[PDB]
Structure 1
Amino acid sequence: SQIPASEQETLVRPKPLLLKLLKSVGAQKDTYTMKEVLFYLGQYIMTKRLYDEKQQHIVYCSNDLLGDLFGVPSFSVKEHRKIYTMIYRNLVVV
């Protein structure tokens, strides 16, 4: 993995729009580890069916709050570092 374990364990405070997104899929707190944020975002992607049904490693996030927060219309889920960077746009580290 390109994401160090200590990074996955970092405690963060999502900004209000990301926080709203996480709560929409059952999150209950204001502070999270990065691994929690990522997992809830994955749940969000599945409930909103943002992944391409025929190419399930591609997410199309245009016209969804996620696309606005990430600043891209689409991404490959294999791009782990890019995804972490896009998440960082939307939080403050504890």
Structure 2
Amino acid sequence: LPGEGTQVHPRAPLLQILKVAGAQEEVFTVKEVMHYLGQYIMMKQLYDKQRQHIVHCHDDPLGELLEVGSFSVKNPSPLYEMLKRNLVIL
């Protein structure tokens, strides 16, 4: 994924999720995209209530993009692979 200063444009399915999280922009840095994804998971309460580094996304639009039913915030590979598929580098 691109560096800190590099700007990206999220593909429609991802942009839609960032919009739910309150994103107004169309062009982001990777860190900004990550901020809104965290907001989204928090708002929809997709994290496991007891072990909160686990996210359950199996029946959510985010799970469709990630292509997994759950992931660990400490094993973020699925997230970065999703971003590679869904971010246009500007």
Q: TM-score, normalised by structure 2?
A: 0.90
- State the AA in 2 paired with 1:48: K
Q: Distance in 2 between matches of 1:79 and 1:93?
A: 24
Aligned residues: 90
Q: Distance in 2 between matches of 1:36 and 1:87?
A: 12
Are 1:13 and 2:17 an aligned pair?
A: no
- Give aligned-pair identity as a percent: 51
Q: Distance in 2 between matches of 1:10 and 1:84?
A: 16
Q: Secondary structure at the match of 1:9?
A: coil
Deviations 1:18-52 (A, max 9, x none): 11111111111111000000010000000001100
More strand by share: 1
> Which of structure 1's runs of 4+ aligned residues deviate more than 3 A?
none
Q: How big is the shift at 1:7?
A: 2.4
Q: TM-score, normalised by structure 1?
A: 0.86
2:87 pairs, out of 67, 78, 91, with 91
Q: Which runs of 5+ in 2 are unaligned?
A: none
Q: How big is the shift at 1:80?
A: 3.4
Q: Which runs of 5+ in 1 are unaligned?
A: none
Report the RMSD for the aligned CA atoms in angstroms. Answer: 1.6
